């Protein structure tokens, strides 16, 4: 009778009591283990799945190889989160706003992208009246008509709603005008961003931790900066919408992992850049001493108008002569010899010139400019190894007991069940929670 | 007759200029743009612009693309050797 | 000419070599998008 | 023999480290293959 889904009517009670009943295993002072069962609290049913996943992933092993300490240190945060979220469940439309964080973020990004493509394509707006693309209007019509239907065929409605939005925009780009359309979309984006900020403050509950806490957090100031940026973009210049594209690295995780390779080990990268600059300085010194007259660069002058010569000397002062090497030597693919004047074989210093060019090329372009790159591949290797190790740990061993997948073999406990009911990591949280709420009597 | 055309009149064409003649060139965008004299008020800013473009794009991103491919070779070889051992 | 594309299907080493770029193609595409974003910003500065 | 090698290579370990489940899931395909191939053995030049 204990198995749910009973054929005889009246199995609602058994299921309802099975849902609120948990079970753990603890130890005593005398190293004796005891099996414990008692009902879960009412407050613990308010935990969100996103918090479950965040706690499941961000927890890290300690020195001895136990996630128990860090898991316990996060219990207070989860308790406060549930206490605050219960109020939100029994609260007005603020809950409706807080439930749609993903929707607001998606609309904000799909706005910013489409309202930056227009700026990139059509600026400046000197000619917009009467079919901005005068020769392409015939080419515009069929493309705009054929864009919508193709997406919606093998795909649900929301992308069709996006296509309808695109149709509504394109029927107004040349009729109403492109600049009023951009102003309307900018105002829309500011409205959506302020709604998203309000929703984020509502969901996070930053107000309970004080002013200093809600101004010292990275994410809130992060979201406020692009509210300010959208305000400036609508009020100062349409080019400020370009900075909004930097949210792409935050929205995606693979981009964050890719970028983290260059900055996880950025100190050797910076020091290698400094070493390259030192080498460039030494070569500039040698060139200033010996080949000062060989530093002749071709240059074209601006239209004189207000007010012939074609070559200027660039090693007159040692700073300018360093700038020459640092600009035209590193960028050129064949060392500094590509930009410097090429001598004849009759020169007294022709052999020294060839030695100088080859030595510069081999020490800088071959060695240092590529030793910089080698570090990046090293950090990819390190990051992949770390990620695979974490994945193996989570998918093989147990969160609390720490026993690996094989030890639970043959024994009538299928590991995959050893964790489902016996050593479940969330029953421990529920039982810790109820201790903090039940009276001591 | 004329030999030079302006390519930053409209911002789309001026993006196309960088995306075509900047990425393909081995030394950043400074190879294709006109090279100024040292007497320009913005000569130092011009050098800063060229070096910054080169270092952020050609050195960093265009090679961070390639690093991923070698990472996937390492991953694939490890997987294949593991299967063969099993 | 399009018939030469059967070479990757006939051989296995070519398939394994090509599979490296597409097994993890999402970060490659996103890095290309990042490069395009940087190019856009530099074009804006140059236009200004 | 080609089916033998394909089953030997394409089978992959499960979460617990056992190829038994996937090997069993391919049994029906092999049975149907043998049933259909017996007809081909006793068939005209289509077998050639
Ligand atoms: C010219 C470049 C124009 C590129 C336009 C991108 C087209 C939108 C692609 C949307 C989607 O397919 O790609 C997503 C990735 O989007 C890309 O990052 C878009 C970046 C493009 C930025 C172009 C820079 C514009 C500057 C032009 C100068 C991957 O997510 P996915 O799992 O597949 O399912 C969609 C789920 N969504 C809707 C929540 C995203
Ligand atoms: C990427 C962001 C770059 C800056 C966004 C564009 C800023 C632009 O829209 O404003 C310019 C601002 O130019 C300012 O002189 C420079 C201020 C600082 C701007 C930073 C330039 C980017 C350098 C980044 C390093 C021009 O001002 P404008 O809207 O036309 O008003 C002038 C109209 N008048 C002549 C009638 C008065
Ligand atoms: C106050 C100053 C605010 C400055 C914000 C931008 C500075 C970027 C340096 C911080 C880098 C790091 O702290 O941010 C990382 C990620 O943030 C990125 O730096 C986004 C920065 C976007 C602007 C920079 C464009 C890249 C060039 C991780 O922190 P977090 O914010 O918790 O990420 C949340 C995890 N998610 C993404 C999965 C939800
Ligand atoms: C191309 C530019 C690459 C760097 C841009 C990075 C923007 C934010 C992305 C962020 O997630 O990456 C961090 C970027 O942090 C940097 O402070 C931001 C770099 C500022 C931009 C550099 C410009 C270089 C171009 C010249 C690097 O890792 P970090 O989250 O810090 O923690 C690593 C652990 N450490 C500190 C112990 C090593
Ligand atoms: C090129 C990309 C450079 C990205 C730098 C990423 C930075 O955040 O990482 C720090 C690099 O710090 C640098 O020394 C100073 C750079 C800080 C400049 C902020 C970003 C500007 C990027 C350069 C332009 C890590 O080094 P650091 O924290 O020092 O001490 C090492 C940690 N140990 C001691 C445990 C090993
Ligand atoms: C990043 C790259 C590293 C920064 C160094 C780049 C230097 C830019 C070029 C500077 C040089 O070309 O100008 C000198 C300017 O010299 C000045 O003393 C130096 C002041 C200006 C240089 C500093 C500007 C860059 C400092 C900021 C570094 C980081 C900038 C990053 C901003 C985002 C020459 O002055 P000038 O007199 O005509 O030359 C005539 C030579 N004579 C006299 C022998 C005939
Ligand atoms: C892949 C590469 C990424 C795609 C972008 C490449 C863009 C091709 C060059 C487009 C540009 O050069 O032409 C513009 C054309 O502008 C049009 O509005 C754009 C329509 C045509 C551009 C779209 C063609 C590419 C879209 C398809 C992308 C993928 C194609 C892949 C096919 C296999 C300029 O028009 P025009 O007027 O003369 O310029 C005069 C400037 N004035 C007015 C200031 C004097
Ligand atoms: C990218 C590096 C190159 C960008 C160089 C800035 C734009 C070049 C310059 O023409 O714009 C400045 C106009 O202001 C800029 O928009 C502000 C400088 C951009 C910020 C530089 C780095 C700041 C770190 C953030 C010039 O102002 P300034 O040299 O002052 O005085 C000259 C007198 N004027 C203004 C009448 C011509
Ligand atoms: C209906 C649309 C048909 C389109 C066919 C070509 C699309 C290629 C994308 C699919 C890639 C993948 O599915 O194909 C791989 C292999 O197929 C390759 O894509 C061949 C494609 C050749 C044409 C593309 C040229 C490469 C550019 C593995 O599938 P499979 O077909 O089972 O391989 C059999 C295993 N063999 C080769 C050892 C016998
Ligand atoms: C150079 C072009 C390289 C890509 C051509 C690939 C042709 C078919 C070869 C096929 O075997 O590779 C796949 C190619 O699949 C792609 O759909 C075909 C790519 C289309 C051609 C890209 C052109 C890029 C040049 C710009 C990549 O792996 P896939 O079999 O998908 O499964 C990986 C597992 N995932 C999906 C979970 C990551
Ligand atoms: C450059 C080569 C690009 C090859 C793309 C290979 C593609 O098939 O791989 C997919 C890349 O998808 C891209 O986002 C969309 C590209 C699809 C375009 C078809 C081939 C055209 C190549 C680009 C030109 C894998 O990413 P996705 O399946 O999304 O989700 C990741 C799987 N997770 C969630 C389990 C981690
Ligand atoms: N100690 C542990 N060792 C290993 N994995 C664990 C452990 N505790 C929990 N897990 C895994 O993390 C998941 C999170 O537990 P959760 O409360 O979500 O379980 P559930 O309610 O039975 O499952 P679901 O909500 O997915 O239907 C578990 O289902 C299990 O897969
Ligand atoms: Ca050069
Ligand atoms: Ca190299
Ligand atoms: Ca070129
Ligand atoms: Ca490179
Ligand atoms: Zn356990």
Q: What is the DSSP string of A96-146?
A: HHHHTHHHHHHHHHHHHHHHHHHHHHH-S-SS-TTTSSTTTHHHHHHHHHH
What number of CA atoms fall less than 13 Å from residue A104's CA on the CB side?
Answer: 18
Kindly tell me the sign of the dihedral angle through the C-alpha atoms of A116, A122, A126, A128.
negative
Question: Which two structure tokens, joined as six digits, stand for A149?
Answer: 């239907």
C-alpha dist (Å) from residue B40 to A298, A309, A339, B31, C48: 15, 16, 20, 18, 17
CB atoms within 10 A of CB A86: 14
Distance from CA of D15 to the nearest CA of A (A): 9
Classify A23 in phi/psi space as left (phi over 0), alpha (psi -120 to 50) or beta: beta
Tokens linked to A73: 């240190």
Alpha helices in A254-364 (DSSP H): 254-264, 266-290, 318-328, 350-360
Q: Does C26 touch chain B (CB under 8 A)?
A: no
**For a pocket test of ligand 2, which of A126, A237, A244 has the largest count of ligand atoms closer than 8 A to its C-beta?**
A237
CA dihedral A110, A114, A119, A125 (to 10 degrees): -130
Q: What angle do CA B78, B81, B84 make, to 5 degrees?
A: 150
Chain A contact partners (≥3 CB pairs within 8 A): B, C, D
Q: Are A203 and A115 within 8 A, CB to CB?
A: no
CB contact under 8 A, B75 and C23: yes
Q: In Å, what is the CA distance from A93 to each residue of A88, A99, A100, A106, A108? A: 9, 10, 11, 20, 20
CA B4 to ligand 15 centroid distance, Å = 15
Per the CB < 8 A criterion, the answer to whether B71 and A385 are in contact is no
Structure tokens at A222: 């992060």
Structure tokens, A397:
């061993």
Exposed/middle/buried for A108, CB within 10 Å: 0-12, 13-18, 19+? buried
| Cα gap A430→D13, rounded to integer Å | 35
What Cα–Cα distance (Å) separates residue B12 from each residue in A103, A129, C44? Answer: 31, 19, 10
| Burial of A90 from C-beta contacts in 10 A (0-12 / 13-18 / 19+) | exposed
Instruction: Give binding residues of D as ranges.
Output: 1, 4
Resolution, expressed in angstroms to one decimal: 3.5
Report the distance separating Cα A328 and Cα A320, nearest Å: 12
**Cα–ligand 17 centroid distance for A41 (angstroms):** 22
N- to C-terminal Cα distance for chain D? 17
Nearest neighbour of A300 by CB, restricted to B30, B34, B64: B34
Give me A395's structure tokens: 């998918």
Alpha-carbon distances, residue A161 vs A108, A155, A158, A182 (angstroms):
16, 11, 5, 20
Residues A115/A189, Cβ–Cβ less than 8 Å: yes
DSSP states of A182-220 as a string?
HHHHHHHHHHHHHHHHHHHHHHHTGGGG-HHHHHH-HHH
Burial of residue A360 (CB within 10 Å: 0-12, 13-18, 19+) is: buried
Q: Are strands A33-36 and A296-298 parallel, antiparallel or unpaired?
A: unpaired
Whether the ω angle into residue A124 lies within 30 degrees of 0, i.e. cis, is: yes
Q: Which residues are bridge partners to A34 per DSSP? A: A26
Residue B55: nearest ligand to its CA? 4
Which atom of ligand 2 lies closest to the CA of C44?
1
Q: Does A380 touch chain B (CB under 8 A)?
A: yes
Q: Which of D13, D15, D21 to mutate to test the interface with A (most CBs of A within 10 A)?
A: D15
Structure tokens at A217: 């957090």
Q: Is B76 on the interface with C (CB under 8 A)?
A: yes
| B60 C-alpha to ligand 3 centroid (Å) | 19
Q: How far is CA A187 from the centre of its chain?
A: 26
> Taking the CB of residue A295, how many other CB atoms lie within 10 A of it?
23
Q: Does D12 touch chain A (CB under 8 A)?
A: no
CA A406 to mean position of chain CA atoms: 37
Burial code (b: 16+ CB inside 10 Å, e: under 16) for A197-213 equals: bebbbbbbbbeeeeeee
Chains that touch C (3 or more CB pairs under 8 A): A, B
Contact in structure between A428 and A24 (CB atoms under 8 Å) = yes
Sign of the dihedral defined by the CA atoms of residues A192, A194, A199, A200, in that order: positive
d(Cα A323, Cα A435) in Å, to the nearest integer? 70
- Name where chain B breaks: residue before each gap, C-N > 2.5 Å: none
Is the CB of C24 inside a 6 Å radius of any atom of ligand 11?
Answer: no
Tell me the CA distances in angstroms from A324 to A295, A302, A359, B46, one per residue in order.
Answer: 8, 20, 18, 13
Which pair of structure tokens corresponds to residue A379?
């950090």
- Residue D31 is encoded by which pair of tokens? 């049975």
Alpha helices in A291-349 (DSSP H): 318-328
d(CA A37, CA A422): 10
Counting one residue from chain B and one from chain C, the pairs whose CB atoms sit within 8 A come to: 64
State the DSSP string of C24-43: THHHHHHHHHHHHHHHHHHH
Alpha-carbon gap, residue A44 to A51, rounded angstroms:
12
CA B60 to chain centre: 9
A105 Cα to chain C: minimum distance (Å): 19
Hey, what are A327's tokens?
């600009």
Touch of D by C (3+ CB pairs closer than 8 Å): no
- Please, how many CA atoms are within 13 Å of residue C10, restricted to the half-sphere of its CB? 5
- CB-neighbour burial class of residue A19 (10 A; exposed 0-12, middle 13-18, buried 19+): exposed
- The number of the ligand 11 atom at minimal distance from the alpha carbon of A254 is 36
Q: Which two tokens stand for residue B85?
A: 């051992």
- Which residue has 């308010």 as its token pair? A46
Which ligand has the nearest atom to the CA of B46?
8
Residue A436: what are its φ and ψ, rounded to 5°? -80, -5
Question: Which residues does B75 contact at the CB level (< 8 Å), separation at least 6?
Answer: A384, C23, C24
Query: How close C18 comes to chain A (CA, Å)?
Result: 20
| Ligand 8 neighbourhood includes B49 CB (under 6 angstroms) | yes
- Give yes or no for a contact between A349 and A291, defined as CB atoms under 8 angstroms apart: yes
Distance of CA A137 to CAs A62, A116, A185, Å? 65, 21, 23
Question: How distant is the alpha carbon of residue A391 from its chain centre?
Answer: 20
DSSP state letter for B35: P
Per DSSP, the residues of A361-387 read IIIIIIIIHHHHHHHHHHHHHHHHHHH
Give me the phi and psi of A33, to 5 degrees please.
Answer: -90, 145
Q: To test the ligand 12 pocket, which listed residue (A40, A425, A427, A433) has its Cβ within 8 A of the most ligand atoms?
A: A425
> Can you say which residues of A are annotated as belonging to the binding site for Ca(2+)?
441
Tokens read off for A2 = 């204990």
Compute the distance between CA of residue A235 and CA of residue A240 in angstroms, rounded to an integer.
10
* Residue where the block lists tokens 């005008």: A177
Answer whether A138 touches C (CB < 8 Å): no
Question: Phi-psi region for residue A69, left (φ > 0), alpha (ψ -120 to 50) or beta?
Answer: alpha
| Total residues belonging to chain B | 86
Residue in chain B nearest C34 by alpha carbon = B61
Quick one: tokens of A389? Answer: 């190790």
H/E stretch holding A242: none
Q: Calculate the dihedral angle through the C-alpha atoms of B78, B82, B84, B85, rounding to the nearest 10 degrees.
A: 130
Is A194 part of the contact surface with chain C (CB cutoff 8 Å)? no
Q: Which residues contact A96 (CB under 8 A, 6 or more apart)?
A: none
CA angle (A278 as vertex; B34, A323 as ends), nearest 5? 20
CA separation for the pair A53, A74 (Å, rounded): 13
How many CB atoms are located within 10 Å of the residue A66 CB?
13
Is the C-beta atom of A372 inside 6 A of ligand 5?
no
Q: How far is the CA of A235 from the centre of ligand 9 (A)?
A: 52
Rounded to a whole number, what is the distance in Å from the CA of A277 to chain B's nearest CA?
Answer: 13
Q: Could you tell me if the CB of B8 is within 6 A of ligand 8?
A: no
Token digits for B61?
Answer: 């991103």
Tokens 């008509």 sit at which residue?
A: A145
- Of the bound ligands, which one is closest to the alpha carbon of residue A250? 3
B71 touches chain C (CB under 8 A): yes
Contacts of A117 in chain B (CB under 8 A): none
**Residue with token string 């210049």:** A237
| Other beta carbons within 10 Å of A124 | 11
Judged by CB atoms closer than 8 Å, whether chains meet at A380 and B68 is answered as: yes
For A:146-185, CB contacts with B below 8 A are none
């Amino acid at each position: 009778m204990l198995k749910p889904g009973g054929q005889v009517d009246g199995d609602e009670a058994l299921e309802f009591y099975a849902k609120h009943t948990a079970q753990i295993e603890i130890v005593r002072l005398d190293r004796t283990m005891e099996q414990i069962v008692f009902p879960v609290p009412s407050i613990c049913e308010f935990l969100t799945k996103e918090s479950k996943l965040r706690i499941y992933y961000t927890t890290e092993r300690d020195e001895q190889g136990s996630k128990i300490n860090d898991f316990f240190l996060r219990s207070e945060d989860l308790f406060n989160e549930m206490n605050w979220q219960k109020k939100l469940r029994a609260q007005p439309v603020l809950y409706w706003c807080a439930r749609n964080m993903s929707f607001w973020s998606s609309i904000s990004f799909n706005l910013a992208v489409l309202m930056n493509l227009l700026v990139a394509f059509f600026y400046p707006f000197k000619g917009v009246r009467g079919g901005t693309l005068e020769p392409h209007w015939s080419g515009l019509l069929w493309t705009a008509m054929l864009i919508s239907l193709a997406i919606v065929i093998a795909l649900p409605k929301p992308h069709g709603i996006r296509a309808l939005i695109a149709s509504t925009i394109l029927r107004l780009i040349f009729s109403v005008g492109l600049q009023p359309t951009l102003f309307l979309l900018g105002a829309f984006n500011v409205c959506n961003k302020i709604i998203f900020l309000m929703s984020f403050v509502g969901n996070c509950g930053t107000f309970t931790r004080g002013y200093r806490a809600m101004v010292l957090d990275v994410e809130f100031l992060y979201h406020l900066l692009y509210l300010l940026i959208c305000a400036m973009g609508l009020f100062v210049h349409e080019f400020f919408y370009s900075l909004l594209l930097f949210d792409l690295v935050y929205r995606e995780e693979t981009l964050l992992n890719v970028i983290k390779s260059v900055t996880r080990n950025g100190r050797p990268i910076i020091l290698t850049a400094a070493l390259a600059l030192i080498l460039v300085y030494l070569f500039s010194i040698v060139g200033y001493l010996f080949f000062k007259d060989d530093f002749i660069l071709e240059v074209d002058r601006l239209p004189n108008e207000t007010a012939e010569q074609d070559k200027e000397h660039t090693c007159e002062t040692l700073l300018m002569c360093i700038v020459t090497v640092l600009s035209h030597g590193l960028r050129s693919g064949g060392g500094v010899g590509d930009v410097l004047r090429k001598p004849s074989k009759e020169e007294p210093l022709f052999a020294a010139r060839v030695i100088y060019d080859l030595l510069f090329f081999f020490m800088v372009i071959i060695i240092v400019l590529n030793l910089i790159f080698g570090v990046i591949i090293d950090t990819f290797a390190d990051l992949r190894s770390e990620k695979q190790k974490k994945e193996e740990i989570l998918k093989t061993t147990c969160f609390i007991c720490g026993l690996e997948r094989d030890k639970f073999d043959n024994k009538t406990v299928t590991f995959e069940e050893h964790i489902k009911e016996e050593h479940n990591m969330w029953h421990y949280l529920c039982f810790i929670v109820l201790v903090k709420v039940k009276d001591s009597t």
